[PDB]
Design a binder for this molecule. Structure first.
Ligand SMILES: CCCCCCCC/C=C\CCCCCCCC(=O)OC[C@H](O)CO
Ligand SMILES: CCCCCCCC/C=C\CCCCCCCC(=O)OC[C@H](O)CO
Ligand SMILES: CCCCCCCC/C=C\CCCCCCCC(=O)O
Length: 429
């Protein structure tokens, strides 16, 4: 017997009973089709199976089992407005949900780490089949996620609510827990979800994504100079010596009064083109392009490109000048685009896409919960208008978190052309 409070939330709960039902059906249809297709695509392709993309298959299977189990039960619960499944199902569904969120966050972390290790080596030789250590990684990811979900199976049980005469059974984390550790988990449930299942995955993925993109940049500027110098060879020793020459060059840029303001203005890609000109003719020579450097600082790419075209540097070496100038105008690596640079652009866009989708889907829920414990008080007479506002955001946050179970296959379709052809070929079959 636990009666509810006032008026405001009742009309909103009824309004969202239809919204949540629509979102649940969309996530179910889009999720069971996208994740099943993605699982088939990853494993059947031998060139993705022997790499870090097998972790995306683990991510897809984790969402897939969450879709088929949690979504239909939650739809039945919303429509019936009562829990009619018994005690066993009241413990299974939260356990399945908690394990799925753990599989998602641990597969995302392992993918960003493996993608960093993949770009940290020259001439890496892939094996045949799933790597043995990646298999241990996936097993451990699922083992840890199940163990961390055991409290949900222990704590959840059915209670009876008294709504001014009407009795309705509710499945929730029981306020009275049997053991001291289990009662502590009831108080720190939301903080534990925010710390381990949001702050930890974001901190690790963004850290290794930064390391991966920095390493991609030092290799792109490496191949950029070797292409412009006619050719060369890669390797850790060759890159280490080349990075020292680049670091010594930028130290001369930052001491030069003419090149310091324009270099700080440019982005990482356009800074590589300025470094290229320094490698070719020295800093005293690059500082002579006073008009062009001013236009680059004012971010007039077309005007600076035209002004650089009418120069002795352009006439003597047209081919190299056109590529360096194109890099200034576009700000991309299109003039030096090869199989290596195109591979790194594909990797960087997919990893950044999955992490961003995960962060945007779970940000409203946690943001709505911090507003509940920093702005709400039971005493205040004006709580029902404020409670009315807080419940809307929490419902929005619950729906946004459910969309993450179907957003990953769609996200890869729009960002990656490699997966887009794989999705079309799979559904054309
Ligand atoms: C009782 C309190 C327990 C609190 C929780 C502690 C145990 C789970 C944490 C890390 C296990 C990660 C290893 C499992 C396999 C995943 C490999 C991986 O990629 O880990 C990502 C990141 O390093 C992970 O911190
Ligand atoms: C540190 C990272 C995770 C540990 C999270 C432990 C969170 C423990 C919170 C216990 C607590 O004091 O809860 C306060 C209440 O929920 C509101 O005032
Ligand atoms: C911080 C509070 C949350 C701690 C998370 C603990 C997760 C599961 C560990 C195993 C629990 C089994 C209890 C019996």
């Amino acid at each position: 017997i636990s009666p509810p409070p006032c008026q405001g939330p009742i009309e909103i709960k009824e309004t969202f009973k239809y919204i949540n039902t629509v979102v649940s059906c969309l996530v179910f249809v889009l999720g069971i089709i996208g994740n099943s297709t993605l699982l088939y695509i990853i494993y059947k392709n031998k060139c993705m199976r022997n790499g870090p993309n097998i972790l995306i298959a683990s991510l897809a299977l984790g969402d897939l089992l969450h879709i088929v189990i949690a979504i239909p039960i939650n739809v039945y619960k919303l429509l019936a407005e009562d829990w009619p499944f018994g005690a066993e199902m009241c413990k299974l569904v939260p356990f399945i949900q908690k394990a799925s969120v753990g599989i998602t966050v641990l597969s995302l972390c392992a993918l960003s780490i493996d993608r960093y290790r993949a770009v940290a080596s020259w001439s890496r030789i892939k094996g045949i089949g799933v790597p043995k250590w990646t298999a241990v990684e996936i097993v451990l990811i699922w083992v840890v996620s199940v163990v961390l979900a055991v409290p949900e199976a222990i704590g959840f049980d059915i209670i009876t609510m008294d709504y001014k005469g009407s009795y309705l059974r509710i499945c929730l984390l029981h306020p009275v827990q049997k053991t001291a550790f289990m009662q502590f988990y009831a108080t720190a449930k939301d903080w534990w979800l925010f710390s381990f299942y949001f702050c930890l995955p974001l901190a690790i993925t963004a850290f290794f994504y930064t390391l991966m993109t920095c390493e991609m940049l030092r290799k792109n500027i490496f191949e950029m100079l070797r292409i412009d110098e006619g050719g060369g060879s890669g390797g850790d020793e060759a890159e280490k010596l080349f990075n020292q020459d680049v670091d010594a060059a930028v130290r001369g840029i930052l001491r030069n009064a003419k090149l310091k303001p324009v270099y700080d203005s440019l982005d990482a890609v356009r800074r590589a083109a300025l470094i290229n000109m320094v490698f070719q003719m020295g800093e005293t020579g690059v500082a002579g392009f006073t008009n062009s450097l001013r236009m680059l600082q004012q971010k007039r790419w077309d005007e600076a490109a035209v002004n650089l075209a009418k120069s002795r540097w352009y006439n003597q070496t047209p081919n190299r000048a056109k590529r360096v100038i194109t890099t200034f105008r576009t700000g991309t690596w299109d003039a030096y685009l090869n199989d290596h640079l195109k591979q790194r652009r594909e990797v960087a866009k997919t990893v950044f896409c999955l992490v961003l989708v995960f962060a945007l889907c779970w940000l409203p829920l946690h943001l709505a919960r911090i507003l509940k414990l920093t702005l709400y008080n039971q005493n205040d007479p004006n709580r029902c208008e404020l409670l009315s506002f807080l419940l809307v955001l929490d419902y929005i946050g619950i729906n946004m978190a459910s969309l993450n179970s179907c957003a990953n296959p769609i996200a890869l379709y729009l960002v990656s052309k490699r997966f887009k052809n794989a999705f079309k070929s799979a559904l054309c079959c």
